[PDB]
Structure 1
Amino acid sequence: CFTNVYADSFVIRGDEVRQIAPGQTGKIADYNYKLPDDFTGCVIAWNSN
Structure 2
Amino acid sequence: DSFVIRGDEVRQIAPGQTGKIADYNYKLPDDFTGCVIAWNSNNLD
Which TM-score bucket, shorter chain as reference?
0.7 to 0.9
TM-score, L = length of structure 2: 0.77
Q: Which runs of 5+ in 2 are unaligned?
A: none
Give unpaired runs (5+ residues) of structure 1.
1-7
What is the alpha-carbon root mean square deviation over aligned residues?
1.3
Q: Which aligned runs of 4 or more in structure 1 are off by greater than 3 angstroms?
A: none
Count of residue correspondences: 42
Identity %: 98
Structure possessing the higher relative contact order (Cα contacts under 8 Å, 6 or more residues apart): 2
Q: Distance in 2 between matches of 1:40 and 1:32?
A: 17
Q: Select the structure that is richer in helix.
A: 2
TM-score (norm 1): 0.72
